[PDB]
């Protein structure tokens, strides 16, 4: 509804929601990787919405479009009655509404906004970092990265040359790899308030 | 990246490729490089007698994490900022590899496709090769070879 989107989602419900998303995704194809990001990933007691980053080895920066990789997942979550509504149907991003299951007699859960982004495999962990935040954390991390001669965005970490020109995207196989490049000791996802 | 990290040489009766090969196996360079041990980045600058157009670039690593190739035009003068990127800063070792000494000698070829077109289209008499290795400062890192291909 309307009033529903303005309600907070207790971490407990976010956890139930995560299970549904990850289970359905794994069932479709275990090579899928899905990560619920946002404040939830940072360990927040509650969330404003659920933000899922989806990737698959078959989908990379260099490969052709693969919208089916996302649509297949969105359609399945519709089939299991989790996604109850579609706001934006994109090739790489779905924006919609979802709702946890309740018993025939149990009281219905509020409808929740959910975004699902399909991200190329080689850009995934940069995406996971970016969308985990926090915003202030990201700002601090980018600043330190620049100081060290790197530019980090949502997609890539690139070495800056001697005249300030960003180089080729660096191969990242984890969030840890990104911190390594900029020689920052790793900050666990739940250690990123600032 | 700055004068004290930059080895400048004149490539008199030799093209960039010959100048580099001779530079890299040159005792003076090796001694200079020795004097710069512990440094996170070093460059060499090839001062070409005849400006040349660089079709493509082959680079053989020697322990560098990143390598970048910039070009410049001496006529009129040329400070650091006047260098144009030819080959964008490119990966040759990961931080892990840098620390473990694994795969220090990767070779990568960069055809017209992988160079900055606007720059590869022009002619240049300054070639700056920048080697960065923040993860293994103490190694005498650099290149085994760099080759420039011209019409
Ligand atoms: Na000039």
Swiss-Prot record, chain A:
Binding site for Mg(2+) 2: 49, 51, 115
Protein residues bound to a 2'-deoxyribonucleoside 5'-triphosphate: 8, 39, 42, 48-49
Catalysed reactions listed for this entry: DNA(n) + a 2'-deoxyribonucleoside 5'-triphosphate = DNA(n+1) + diphosphate; a 5'-end 2'-deoxyribose-2'-deoxyribonucleotide-DNA = (2E,4S)-4-hydroxypenten-2-al-5-phosphate + a 5'-end 5'-phospho-2'-deoxyribonucleoside-DNA + H(+); 2'-deoxyribonucleotide-(2'-deoxyribose 5'-phosphate)-2'-deoxyribonucleotide-DNA = a 3'-end 2'-deoxyribonucleotide-(2,3-dehydro-2,3-deoxyribose 5'-phosphate)-DNA + a 5'-end 5'-phospho-2'-deoxyribonucleoside-DNA + H(+)
Full-protein interval shown: 142 to 335 of 335
Sorted UniProt keywords: Acetylation, Cytoplasm, DNA damage, DNA repair, DNA replication, DNA synthesis, DNA-binding, DNA-directed DNA polymerase, Isopeptide bond, Lyase, Magnesium, Metal-binding, Methylation, Nucleotidyltransferase, Nucleus, Potassium, Sodium, Transferase, Ubl conjugation
Gene of this entry: Polb
Annotated organism of origin: Rattus norvegicus (Rat)
Gene Ontology BP terms: apoptotic process; base-excision repair; base-excision repair, gap-filling; DNA damage response; DNA replication; double-strand break repair via nonhomologous end joining; homeostasis of number of cells; immunoglobulin heavy chain V-D-J recombination
Region of interest: DNA-binding: 42-51
Identification of the protein by name: DNA polymerase beta
The keyword Zinc is annotated on this UniProt entry: no
Modified residues annotated as Omega-N-methylarginine in this record: 11
Compartment(s): Nucleus; Cytoplasm
Binding site for Mg(2+) 1: 49, 51
Domain remark from Swiss-Prot or TrEMBL: Residues 239-252 form a flexible loop which appears to affect the polymerase fidelity.
GO CC, one annotated term: microtubule
E.C. numbers: 2.7.7.7, 4.2.99.-, 4.2.99.18
Effect on the protein upon substituting residue 50 to I: No loss of activity
Effect of residue 49 to E/S: Loss of activity
Chief subcellular location: nucleus
GO terms assigned for molecular function: 5'-deoxyribose-5-phosphate lyase activity; class I DNA-(apurinic or apyrimidinic site) endonuclease activity; damaged DNA binding; DNA binding; DNA-directed DNA polymerase activity; enzyme binding; lyase activity; metal ion binding
Function of the molecule: Repair polymerase that plays a key role in base-excision repair. During this process, the damaged base is excised by specific DNA glycosylases, the DNA backbone is nicked at the abasic site by an apurinic/apyrimidic (AP) endonuclease, and POLB removes 5'-deoxyribose-phosphate from the preincised AP site acting as a 5'-deoxyribose-phosphate lyase (5'-dRP lyase); through its DNA polymerase activity, it adds one nucleotide to the 3' end of the arising single-nucleotide gap.
Cofactor(s) of this protein: Mg(2+)
Summary of subunit composition and partner proteins: Monomer. Binds single-stranded DNA (ssDNA). Interacts with APEX1, LIG1, LIG3, FEN1, PCNA and XRCC1. Interacts with HUWE1/ARF-BP1, STUB1/CHIP and USP47. Interacts with FAM168A.
Cofactor note: Binds 2 magnesium ions per subunit.
Curated annotation (Swiss-Prot), chain B:
Entry comment on modification after translation: Phosphorylation by CK2 promotes interaction with APTX and APLF.
Top-level division of the source organism's lineage: Eukaryota
UniProt source species: Homo sapiens
Pathological condition linked to this protein in its record: Spinocerebellar ataxia, autosomal recessive, 26: A form of spinocerebellar ataxia, a clinically and genetically heterogeneous group of cerebellar disorders due to degeneration of the cerebellum with variable involvement of the brainstem and spinal cord. SCAR26 is a progressive disease characterized by gait and limb ataxia, loss of independent ambulation, oculomotor apraxia, and peripheral neuropathy with distal muscle weakness and areflexia.
Function: Scaffold protein involved in DNA single-strand break repair by mediating the assembly of DNA break repair protein complexes. Negatively regulates ADP-ribosyltransferase activity of PARP1 during base-excision repair in order to prevent excessive PARP1 activity. Recognizes and binds poly-ADP-ribose chains: specifically binds auto-poly-ADP-ribosylated PARP1, limiting its activity.
Subcellular location: Nucleus; Chromosome
Protein name as it appears in the record: DNA repair protein XRCC1
Positions of modified residues (Phosphoserine): 139
Tissue: Expressed in fibroblasts, retinal pigmented epithelial cells and lymphoblastoid cells (at protein level).
Quaternary structure (record): Homodimer. Interacts with polynucleotide kinase (PNK), DNA polymerase-beta (POLB) and DNA ligase III (LIG3). Interacts with APTX and APLF. Interacts with APEX1; the interaction is induced by SIRT1 and increases with the acetylated form of APEX1. Interacts with (poly-ADP-ribosylated) PARP1.
């Amino acid at each position: 509804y309307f009033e529903d989107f303005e309600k907070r989602i207790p971490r407990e419900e976010m956890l139930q929601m995560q299970d549904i998303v990850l289970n359905e995704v794994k069932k479709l194809d275990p090579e899928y990787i899905a990560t619920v990001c946002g404040s939830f990933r940072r360990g927040a007691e509650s969330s404003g919405d659920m933000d899922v980053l989806l990737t698959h080895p078959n989908f990379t920066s260099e490969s052709s479009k693969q919208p089916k990789l996302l649509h297949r997942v969105v359609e399945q979550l519709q089939k299991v009655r989790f996604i109850t509504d579609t706001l934006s149907k994109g090739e790489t991003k779905f924006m919609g509404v979802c709702q946890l299951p309740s018993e025939n007699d149990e009281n219905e859960y509020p409808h929740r906004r959910i975004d699902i982004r399909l991200i190329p495999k080689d850009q995934y962990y940069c995406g996971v970092l970016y969308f985990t935040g926090s915003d202030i954390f990201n700002k601090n991390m980018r600043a330190h990265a620049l100081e060290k001669g790197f530019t980090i965005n949502e997609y890539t970490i690139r070495p800056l040359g001697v005249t300030g020109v960003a180089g080729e995207p660096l191969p990242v196989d984890s969030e840890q790899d990104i911190f390594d490049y900029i020689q920052w000791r790793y900050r666990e996802p739940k250690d990123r308030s600032e | 990246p700055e004068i004290r990290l930059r080895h400048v040489v004149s490539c008199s009766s030799q093209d960039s490729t010959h100048c580099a090969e001779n530079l890299l196996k040159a005792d003076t360079y090796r001694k200079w490089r020795a004097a710069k041990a512990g440094e996170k980045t070093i460059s060499v600058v090839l001062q070409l007698e005849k400006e040349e157009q660089i079709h493509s670039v082959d680079i053989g690593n020697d322990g560098s994490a990143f390598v970048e190739v910039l070009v410049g035009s001496s006529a009129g003068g040329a400070g650091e900022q006047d260098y144009e990127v030819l080959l964008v800063t490119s990966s040759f070792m990961s931080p892990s590899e840098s620390r473990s000494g694994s795969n220090p000698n990767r070779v990568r070829m960069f055809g017209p496709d992988k160079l900055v077109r606007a720059a590869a289209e022009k002619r240049w008499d300054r070639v700056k090769i920048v080697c960065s290795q923040p993860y293994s400062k103490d190694s005498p890192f650099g290149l085994s070879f760099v080759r420039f291909h011209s019409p």
